[PDB]
Symmetry: C7
């Protein structure tokens, strides 16, 4: 199951980092195996309502705690294949006082790296890049 | 099922890009087939509560992670057929310091492209265009 | 069922546009027919929990994605029959720097149109008009 | 049932407008009759899970779409019987730049009307009056 | 049941106003009696799922509509027995431009009354007092 | 059960005030006894769905109304054992105009007390201290 | 079970502090044992719906009360292995007036410690570091 999930993630392009892909494949395989085991246990007569409730509560708490990380990952996935965000492109993000100015140097799954005029490296979250006015010179 | 979903999306006009339409058709066909298979499995006696709980948790997490993308897509769908947003029209979006000024050059499913006076390309999110005061000269 | 829903929407005044009324009637008729079919299927013994879960997840995601459009529509419905918002009335919306000044020219289900002193057409969202201080001269 | 709901709304003072009271009585009577009919149908053996799910989804979407209207109505109900908000009383609402200054002229279920020094009529939402610092001279 | 709920509210100190206490006692007695009646009806065989769903939807909508009132009431309950908020005490609420300055004159379940230097009566919501920096001279 | 809950709260250090500990022990014992009684009633055949629904709705409404108090309590629990927040330590909380300056004098479960340069006592909510930049000289 | 959870937390690197790891292991072991006991009780015939409802309500309230702590912990986990945040690195967090300037001195699971130019110790929450523009010189 781990190999199947790894191949699916590679083909769909959701995860490109091999380490993240392996970790996600392991997590997904564990979740699927647990769900199948719970269904098999409940088939024969064993009550599964407490187990389902506890698993759902834990999963909801974990997902709500990792909301920012998930949002940044989804923004990174969506922003892929954008002509504005390319290496060497001078971009400006934000309107008003909350403005960010620099040249794109590297692209990540959590941050967008810009090189300022003074040489400082700027780490702009991908969610911030998603919900903002991007100005490309 | 994929062809049926593709034809439905084409006729309803929700998705116009052929690639996005094909991807959405594949996803919808997979979801419908999975739901039918789960119902058939539960009909004969196999417990389906753990599978339903896991699928619902995963779907809720994915939908909450793609909230910004979905909102931008819905805003793009709604804004279609607006006389204010046309190629060559000079529009102004926002009130106060958070103001955006330019001429519409291209329209997308994620961004609204404006050409400033200096020539910089502005990427205004469609959700931002939805919930803002649009000024058309 | 489509004719019944169209007549109900016409009588209740929720939807006045014939095209929107027809689309809403078709959607409502489809939803009611699907619910009745699911209930009939579940009556004879076929498990319906996976189908109900999938339909509910899809409906919740769609409704949460169209939240802004629904809010604007409800604001348009509520604001109807307001003496302040009339054609030719000079109104001012907002307090502070985020202020909008103009004369009402046309009223829509998504936007409120104002003509500025310079002649620019202002598109004020109906939700913004709902939750703001309206100043009428 | 309509007469009973109308009398209850009149006695409890939640709704004072006869038209709004009649509309709310009709809606409540329809909801109660539908719930009783669904319970009776489910008693004899007909599956009611799809119908309950569809009705709940529709009701949740409608209630979330009318959130602002409901909040304004509740604020209007709560603010009743306040010595500060009386006809002819000079009140000031808000702190900082977002300030509203005028004399109370009329009170509504959606807006609070103030007459400025220049004579402009101010429409302050009741929810805004609830969650703000009210200054009475 | 009304007398029991009234005595409980009096002893626990949640509600001190006799009118509010009587209204809350009536509401709580009605809710408990309705729940017991529904349970008794469902015991003998009558389906109760539609009734439970409708009651839950109505209760959730009402509770979400009265969120501000409930929050202000809870803040009033919590703030009781605070040395800073006493009659004749000169307090300052808020930081920055959104600042409120005055002397405490009267305390309520919805508002905190302050007398300014000019003599204007300030109505500070109890929720605002809860989530703000209180400065006591 | 009250003694067991009191001892557990004392050992875990969640509640240190004897009065609050006793009140929480009474509430927890009542909740556990009610849950056990409901389970016993439902075991013999009495329908418990209406009772569970009503109890859950009431508990959710109460918990959502006491959200600020619960958040402040949790922040007080978390901030315990912080070298920055000590008696006699000069700390500064917040960035920008919304800044608070003073010396720590007393620590509470709802507020953090600071003594300004002029001698005014500042009541900073513990939730505000949690989600802010603390500057220690 | 406590030893298994402790080893899992150590291997996965989610918790590095031995005290926090032991506390989390105890909590997780208690939760798993309680879920298994509830399932075993419900298998033989004892109704478990009230117990599940009460446990779920309590868990949801606790998780919503500890939302800030959980978010800060998740941000601390995510930020690990970032070249920008290292001891002795001069970083700047935030844009506009809400800006923080200093040199990293120590890293924690709740705060990020910076040494200003004047020598004041700055406590920047990890969630704030996650959702902000980090400037590294």
């Amino acid at each position: 199951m781990k190999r199947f999930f790894n191949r699916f993630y590679l083909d769909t392009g959701i995860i490109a980092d091999p380490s993240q892909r392996s970790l996600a494949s392991r997590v997904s395989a564990f979740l699927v195996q647990g769900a199948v085991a719970f269904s098999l246990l409940g088939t024969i007569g064993v009550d599964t309502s407490p187990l389902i409730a506890a698993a759902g509560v834990t999963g909801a708490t974990i997902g709500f705690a990792c909301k920012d990380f998930g949002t940044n990952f989804v923004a990174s996935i969506v922003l892929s294949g954008q002509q504005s965000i390319r290496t060497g492109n001078l971009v400006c993000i934000g309107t008003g006082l909350n403005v960010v100015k620099g040249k794109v140097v590297d692209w990540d799954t959590r941050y967008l790296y810009l090189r300022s005029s003074e040489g400082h490296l700027l780490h702009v979250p991908n969610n911030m890049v998603l919900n903002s006015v991007v100005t490309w010179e």
